[PDB]
Amino acid sequence: MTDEKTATARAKVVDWCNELVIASPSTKCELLAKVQETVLGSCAELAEEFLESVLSLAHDSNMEVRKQVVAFVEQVCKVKVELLPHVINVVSMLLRDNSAQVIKRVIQACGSIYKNGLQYLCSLMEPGDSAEQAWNILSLIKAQILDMIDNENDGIRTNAIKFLEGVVVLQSFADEDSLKRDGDFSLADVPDHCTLFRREKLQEEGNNILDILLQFHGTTHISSVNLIACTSSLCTIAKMRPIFMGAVVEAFKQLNANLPPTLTDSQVSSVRKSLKMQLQTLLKNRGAFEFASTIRGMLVDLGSSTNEIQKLIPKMDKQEMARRQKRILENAA
């Protein structure tokens, strides 16, 4: 059964796509907003044929226009993720962009894009050649953004650190001590039937990205913003994947003992206040059991009272403690 809705919507977007080639960049962004709310919202069916119309605007001279393309492509992977291989090329291309404002926006969008992209590809039972192509671009996107931690722009570095946080979380296994988070996806959610990649190789990559973040976090000439972002990213990783808790607690311990001499007095106070918050969050995790006294030590150094710290520690039954206490004894041998 049919009606007029699709045809009436197609006529509306054809009008809007025609105005684009003769519109000023300011008018172009207004037009694209309306085309996205229709083509990905009101009449979602119009996605496939008006794709190339929008993806061509990735080459436009105005950076606002380029940023709108990113916003669109990020929405496509949210609502019509089957179109992923037809959009993912523009994303890897826009990571070579000249404007830092565009780079930052692309890295931001790559967070959801990589998660949605990874979820979709490992859901396919008989993946085609286009699926292998999309995965290859996703692998390159990770590598591209990983290089941006050594970018000269502080804002790029910050966004790059935030991106790498979600990759580590995706590319590791959740457990009993993992924080309950609604859309949480781990390597446990990656099937054995998947040919596109192996769980062991993603875990290896996740461990290498974490090693890089841990080293980055401990340098002497890191910016205050990069340090704060990195610290909170390490906290998110450890609370989501408590297997990394010991490493993150050690990084935090090392930082509080050796604050970079490039930090200003204000930057130190800012860094320490954020560090305090991250430690308080981690102490609430059941997986921090083993490091409770270390964490308490640091919180006392950062001005928490005995009773403030005490209230954060989760209550455990004695049989649960004995399971943990004995798992900690067997792993040390």
Binding site: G155, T158, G166, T264, D265, K273
Partner: protein, 190 residues
């Protein structure tokens, strides 16, 4: 002039945020303001004037008018309520808004903590960073005005930058020196 989305945050969303909101709006900035408190608290020391967030500024005006029109004329609170009703309908709570900013400015450390706690408590979706800055403003009419000039001065300097992320730490550092102040500066994510 530039395309900065700014928010000024206090306890109340009454005195210090509105003084800054007023001056930033007059400078052409895309500015919004919020309060971090549970409820809206106005000035005996143990007897304050409490209202809900979402209460129109005009309803608070008529409430304090019918209670005692003379007292709140002498302390200039009706003059403040006048200013705020011209800027927007009702005071808003930061913890409830779905609006996104480039810069957030808090007027004391205790507010800063509240903002940071809240933002951190929510899982990041867009992965978009935002700079949270604290500029200490002592809570009284005279100091809320002087403070609003400092905050405006600071945002003007930041608006001038062609790459804020890449320049902000230097800008703050030298601003702190020149104005003999301490600006706590953190980065949070949406």
């Amino acid at each position: 002039p530039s395309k900065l989305a700014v928010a000024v945050v206090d306890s109340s969303n009454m005195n210090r945020s509105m003084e800054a909101h007023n001056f930033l709006a007059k400078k052409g900035f895309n500015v919004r303001s919020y309060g971090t408190g549970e409820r809206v608290k106005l000035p005996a020391f143990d007897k304050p004037n409490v209202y809900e967030f979402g209460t129109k500024y005009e309803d608070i005006y008529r409430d304090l008018e019918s209670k005692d029109k003379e007292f709140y004329t002498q302390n200039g609170l009706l003059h403040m309520l006048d200013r705020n009703r011209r800027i927007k309908k009702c005071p808003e709570r930061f913890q409830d808004t779905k609006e996104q900013f480039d810069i957030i400015v808090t007027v004391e450390e205790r507010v800063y903590d509240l903002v940071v706690m809240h933002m951190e408590s929510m899982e990041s979706v867009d992965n978009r960073p935002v700079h949270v800055l604290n500029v200490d403003v002592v809570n009284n009419a005279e100091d809320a005005l002087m403070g609003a000039f400092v905050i405006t001065d600071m945002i003007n300097m930041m608006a001038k930058s062609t790459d804020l992320d890449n320049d902000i730490d230097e800008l703050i550092q030298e601003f702190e020196e020149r104005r003999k102040r301490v600006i706590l500066h953190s980065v949070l994510f949406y």
